[PDB]
Ligand binder design. Structure first.
Ligand code: 0CH
Ligand code: SF4
Length: 309
């Protein structure tokens, strides 16, 4: 059985920065360091950090006075930030710079009192954080997930309307929502294409090329990671069996029995050691040396804030 590796795969620049922010906090200040939400949606990364004394909470009212609190890479609402700010807390912000870029647009729309539409998945923490930058009651901030949602949306002034997206969506599905938004609201203003980040776009392009070659695709990533689920979905829609797995223990022998080519990729929140262990297990199940595919080069790094070097 041949094993192909997608390229690019695995950690993006925002995830590497956010993990480094927690580790450095722990190294500088000691345990405990509190973190609002899983710093990234990866069970291994979060368990790792938990065993080293990070405490992950959902709500700020779970954090003691005077503690150190880190916001996860997904970002947080103005309300969360004020709730932390007017509290005793030392805060470091691990929000990815590419999520903050979208927040700055929503904030500008809010100040002008002009309506904004976010394309994103209800309940996702990045969506809560981004919707949560809009506060002007004179305007409005609306979430849409699909063309159907666009077809039922009514707004107050469609002459003054902008859109923004979550960064970890399907490029193809988002394109269909934006096509609907432009047809419904011909004056709507937005980015050229979407706010989908380089890392999401690049891993979906890489998984398309992988699925073209492989009969079965394993995507290393946790169930609550949006971008990881989009990679699995993409391979499934190309007609390949695709599984989202946390680690090598999850591989069921039936999935690769009689399979001549298996592909492996990893979401932006999944560490390389997990892919290494998945490859070692596929080798036990008859796979040969892992062959990395040729891929688009990634060169972006985001540094930790100087306070945490
Ligand atoms: O893919 P999602 O947005 O669920 O988040 P993740 O933690 O799995 O991957 C890194 C994204 C962090 C902010 O975009
Ligand atoms: S997936 Fe994209 S937006 Fe999210 S942390 Fe990575 S680079 Fe940033």
């Amino acid at each position: 059985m041949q094993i192909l590796l997608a390229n690019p795969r695995g950690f993006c620049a925002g995830v590497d920065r956010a993990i480094s922010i927690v580790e450095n906090a722990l190294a500088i200040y000691g345990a405990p360091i509190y973190v609002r939400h899983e710093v990234v949606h990866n069970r291994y990364v979060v368990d790792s950090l938990r065993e080293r004394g990070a405490i992950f909470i959902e709500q700020i009212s779970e954090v003691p006075d005077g503690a150190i609190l880190i916001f996860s890479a997904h970002g947080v609402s103005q309300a969360v930030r004020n709730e932390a700010k007017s509290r005793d807390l030392t805060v470091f912000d691990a929000t990815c710079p590419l999520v903050t870029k979208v927040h700055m647009e929503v904030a500008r729309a809010s100040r002008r009192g002009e309506e904004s539409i976010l394309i994103g998945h209800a309940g996702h923490p990045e969506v809560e954080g981004t919707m949560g930058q809009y506060s002007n009651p004179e305007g409005g901030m609306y979430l849409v997930e699909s063309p159907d949602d666009v077809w039922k949306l009514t707004v107050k002034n469609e002459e003054k309307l902008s859109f923004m997206t979550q960064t970890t969506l399907s490029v193809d599905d988002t394109s269909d929502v934006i096509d609907a938004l432009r047809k419904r609201f011909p004056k709507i203003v937005g980015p050229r294409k979407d706010d989908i980040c380089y890392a999401t776009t690049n891993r979906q392009e890489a998984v398309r090329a992988l699925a073209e070659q492989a009969e079965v695709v394993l995507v290393v990533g946790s169930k609550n990671s949006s971008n990881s689920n989009r990679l699995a979905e993409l391979a499934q829609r190309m007609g390949k069996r695709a599984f989202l797995i946390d680690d090598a223990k999850d591989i069921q022998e039936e999935w690769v029995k009689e399979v001549k080519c298996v592909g492996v990729t990893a979401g932006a929140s999944a560490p390389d050691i997990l892919v290494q262990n998945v490859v070692a297990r596929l080798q036990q199940l008859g796979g040969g040396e892992a062959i990395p595919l040729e891929g688009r080069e990634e060169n972006i790094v985001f540094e930790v804030p100087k306070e945490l070097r």
